[PDB]
Amino acid sequence: GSMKKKEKGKEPKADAECSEWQYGKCVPNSGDCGNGIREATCNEQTKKTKCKVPCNWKKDFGADCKYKFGRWAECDTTTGTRSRSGTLKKALFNAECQTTIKVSKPCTPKTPKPKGGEKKKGKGKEN
């Protein structure tokens, strides 16, 4: 009977791949914000990659309407909020804007009390 069997050919390797290229911070070179540059070094080479920073400069148009506000009237206990009406001078944008605004916000008449606060002591015995 012959039940012999053996086969090999895969020695362990240390390897040296760079899948997690250590990228450096992103600094905006052009202008104050936008296209930044980052320095990264892996394996045995150094290169700079461009990136984009979270800047708020991608606005163009929108309401394009000019409104005129004054006050907020007195606080109403009914709904707990007061409504204010404003008038716009410049319409523009598409065709025309509302000739009046209807806003509302909760406000108290007086006596500014705490939302809830909290008070807890700590009594303990040493023995």
Residues 62 and 80 in one domain: yes
- Cα 86 to the center of its chain, rounded Å: 31
Please indicate the experimental technique that yielded this structure: NMR
Residues 53 and 72 in one domain: no
Residue 91 CB partners (closer than 8 Å, separation 6+) = 65, 97
Distances (CA, A) of 18 to 3, 23, 41: 45, 12, 10
Q: Let me know: does 76 contact 63? Beta carbons within 8 Å.
A: no
Q: Would you give the end-to-end CA distance of the chain in angstroms? A: 84
Residues 105 and 64 in one domain: yes
DSSP string, 75-113: PPTTTSEEEEEEEEEE--SSS---SSEEEEEE--SS---
Distances (CA, A) of 92 to 16, 62, 69, 99, 103: 63, 11, 18, 12, 21
- CA 3, CA 88: separation in Å to the nearest integer? 97
Residue 88 counted as domain residue: yes
Residue 31 counted as domain residue: yes
> Which domain does 34 fall in, by range?
20-57
Residues 37 and 69 in one domain: no
Count, residues in the chain:
127
Residues 105 and 67 in one domain: yes
List the structure tokens of 121. Answer: 């002591």
